Structures are given as C-alpha cells and as structure tokens.
Amino acid sequence: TYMKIADYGQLGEYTCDAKCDAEFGEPGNIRHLEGKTYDYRGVFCFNRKNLQ
Amino acid sequence: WKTAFYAVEKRPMFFEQYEGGSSAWCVKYQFGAEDGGFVGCCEHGRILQI
C-alpha cells in the first residue's frame, strides 16, 4: 500500500489587518490505497535417456 | 500613626502576559496586586470638626 495525497487545501486568505484571528481553510486528502502483485508459473518435463 | 492604623501588604503589583486570550496577532496583559488595611486601637487618634 502507499499514500496518494490528493490536493493540499487552501489555507491562507489575506485577511484585513485588524482582526485578532485567522479564518479556517479547506483540508487535504491523502487516500491510503493499495495494490497487489501477480505470479507467473509453468512446468515442462523430460525423459532421462532421451536427454542424455 | 505607627500604631493607630496598620497597613497590610500581601503581594505587590505584578504584570504577566495572559497566555490564553492572546493570539499570534493580539496580546492580552493582566496585572494585579493584593493588599489591605485596618485600624489598630482607635483610642490613639483624633479628628477635628466644625
């Protein structure tokens, strides 16, 4: 699994220079998603004399 | 006066930044002091009137 951070939010706002506080901003998502892995296999035979 | 009226002092004036209510753009200061007074024996004084 791995992280996928979606989009940083909009944090700052350029407020007026009088208020003693900020103003809330939008959040960001991270989307911890996963993914699997496959396998590959097969066989093959032989005689023993017919290979010597 | 040194024995007719007593003055009581407990904690002198003090100033301190009031952390809480103060943000990164506005400070809130808080000051205070604690004292009192009473009369001693009031047969030591006198008052003049009209």
- Locus of tokens 């004084």: B45
- Locus of tokens 């009473």: B38
User: CA-CA distances (angstroms) from residue A37 to A1, A27, A43?
Assistant: 11, 32, 21
- Locus of tokens 């003090």: B14
**Can you read off the two tokens belonging to residue A18?**
């009088």
> A with B: how many residue pairs have Cβ under 8 Å apart?
6
- Please tell me whether residue B9 adopts helix, strand or coil conformation: strand
Method: cryo-EM
CA distance A39 to B44: 107
**Can you read off the two tokens belonging to residue B6?**
């007593």
Which residues on A lie below 8 Å from B23 (Cβ)?
A: 20-21
CB contact B23 to A (< 8 Å): yes
CA distance A33 to B4: 84
